[PDB]
Protein backbone atom coordinates (compact mmCIF):
# COMPACT_ATOMS: atom_id res chain seq x y z
CA UNK A 1 0.00 0.00 0.00
CA UNK A 2 1.15 3.81 -0.84
CA UNK A 3 -0.38 4.38 2.82
CA UNK A 4 1.62 1.36 4.04
CA UNK A 5 4.89 1.83 2.55
CA UNK A 6 4.54 5.82 3.77
CA UNK A 7 4.08 4.11 7.52
CA UNK A 8 6.45 1.75 7.20
CA UNK A 9 9.01 4.49 6.40
CA UNK A 10 7.89 6.95 8.86
CA UNK A 11 7.84 3.28 11.53
CA UNK A 12 11.56 3.12 10.75
CA UNK A 13 12.39 6.60 10.92
CA UNK A 14 11.29 7.52 14.15
CA UNK A 15 12.39 4.12 16.13
CA UNK A 16 15.75 4.95 15.09
CA UNK A 17 15.01 8.77 16.22
CA UNK A 18 13.85 7.13 19.52
CA UNK A 19 16.74 4.98 19.54
CA UNK A 20 19.59 7.57 19.24
CA UNK A 21 21.65 8.58 22.64
CA UNK A 22 20.30 12.11 22.59
CA UNK A 23 16.65 11.00 22.73
CA UNK A 24 16.27 10.52 25.94
CA UNK A 25 15.14 14.04 26.70
CA UNK A 26 12.41 13.74 24.35
CA UNK A 27 10.41 10.42 25.28
CA UNK A 28 7.87 12.00 26.96
CA UNK A 29 5.83 14.83 27.38
CA UNK A 30 7.70 17.62 29.79
CA UNK A 31 6.57 17.75 32.99
CA UNK A 32 4.63 20.89 34.34
CA UNK A 33 5.59 20.50 37.40
CA UNK A 34 9.39 20.27 36.46
CA UNK A 35 9.16 23.00 33.72
CA UNK A 36 7.81 26.62 35.01
CA UNK A 37 5.46 28.24 32.93
CA UNK A 38 6.54 25.62 30.03
CA UNK A 39 3.40 25.47 29.27
CA UNK A 40 2.62 29.40 29.20
CA UNK A 41 5.15 29.84 26.23
CA UNK A 42 5.41 26.36 24.18
CA UNK A 43 1.60 26.73 22.67
CA UNK A 44 1.97 23.12 20.71
CA UNK A 45 4.26 20.34 23.03
CA UNK A 46 5.43 17.36 21.52
CA UNK A 47 7.72 14.37 22.47
CA UNK A 48 8.15 11.37 20.79
CA UNK A 49 5.58 9.08 23.13
CA UNK A 50 3.28 11.40 21.86
CA UNK A 51 4.23 10.65 17.82
CA UNK A 52 4.58 6.72 18.66
CA UNK A 53 0.84 7.00 19.44
CA UNK A 54 -0.12 9.41 16.56
CA UNK A 55 2.00 7.04 14.07
CA UNK A 56 -0.22 4.04 15.47
CA UNK A 57 -3.24 5.86 14.96
CA UNK A 58 -2.51 6.67 11.51
CA UNK A 59 -2.58 10.24 11.75
CA UNK A 60 0.63 10.67 9.59
CA UNK A 61 -1.51 10.24 6.73
CA UNK A 62 1.85 12.75 4.73
CA UNK A 63 5.31 13.59 5.28
CA UNK A 64 4.91 16.95 5.92
CA UNK A 65 2.63 16.40 9.25
CA UNK A 66 5.48 14.06 10.41
CA UNK A 67 8.33 16.23 9.42
CA UNK A 68 5.88 19.40 11.17
CA UNK A 69 5.72 17.49 14.65
CA UNK A 70 9.16 15.67 15.31
CA UNK A 71 10.55 19.27 13.69
CA UNK A 72 8.48 20.99 16.77
CA UNK A 73 10.16 18.31 19.23
CA UNK A 74 13.06 20.48 18.66
CA UNK A 75 12.29 24.02 17.84
CA UNK A 76 9.98 23.80 21.25
CA UNK A 77 13.35 23.05 23.58
CA UNK A 78 15.46 25.31 21.14
CA UNK A 79 12.93 27.74 22.41
CA UNK A 80 12.53 27.17 25.91
CA UNK A 81 15.78 25.85 27.37
CA UNK A 82 19.30 27.86 27.60
CA UNK A 83 21.58 27.46 24.47
CA UNK A 84 24.51 25.30 26.55
CA UNK A 85 21.96 23.65 28.28
CA UNK A 86 22.22 19.51 28.25
CA UNK A 87 18.42 20.05 26.38
CA UNK A 88 19.64 22.10 23.82
CA UNK A 89 22.56 20.36 22.89
CA UNK A 90 20.31 17.01 22.61
CA UNK A 91 18.12 18.75 20.65
CA UNK A 92 20.61 19.99 17.97
CA UNK A 93 22.23 16.39 17.61
CA UNK A 94 19.15 14.59 17.22
CA UNK A 95 17.98 17.18 14.80
CA UNK A 96 20.75 16.72 12.49
CA UNK A 97 20.42 13.28 12.75
CA UNK A 98 16.42 13.68 11.76
CA UNK A 99 17.73 15.60 8.57
CA UNK A 100 19.62 12.64 7.63
CA UNK A 101 17.35 10.48 7.88
CA UNK A 102 14.70 12.32 6.10
CA UNK A 103 17.05 12.86 3.63
CA UNK A 104 18.30 9.08 3.12
CA UNK A 105 14.76 8.10 3.05
CA UNK A 106 14.12 10.70 -0.11
CA UNK A 107 11.17 12.52 2.11
CA UNK A 108 12.81 15.93 0.90
CA UNK A 109 14.75 15.53 -2.61
C1 LIG B 1 11.66 22.19 30.24
C2 LIG B 1 12.03 20.75 30.22
N1 LIG B 1 12.08 20.09 31.36
N2 LIG B 1 12.33 18.81 31.01
C3 LIG B 1 12.31 17.79 32.07
C4 LIG B 1 10.92 17.57 32.64
O1 LIG B 1 10.01 17.02 31.66
C5 LIG B 1 12.48 18.65 29.66
C6 LIG B 1 12.30 19.90 29.12
C7 LIG B 1 12.42 20.17 27.70
O2 LIG B 1 12.26 21.31 27.24
C8 LIG B 1 12.67 18.99 26.80
C9 LIG B 1 13.40 17.82 27.49
C10 LIG B 1 12.75 17.43 28.84
Same mark, same amino acid.
Given at each position: ?9 ? $???? @? @????? @???? %???? %? =? ?13 ? %???? /? ?12 ? $? ?8 ? =? ?8 ? %?????? $? ?10 ? /?? $? ?6
Amino acid at each position: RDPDQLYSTL $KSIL @Q @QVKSH @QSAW %PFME %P =VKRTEAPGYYEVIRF %PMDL /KTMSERLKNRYYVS $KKLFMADLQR =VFTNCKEYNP %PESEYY $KCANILEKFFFS /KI $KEAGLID
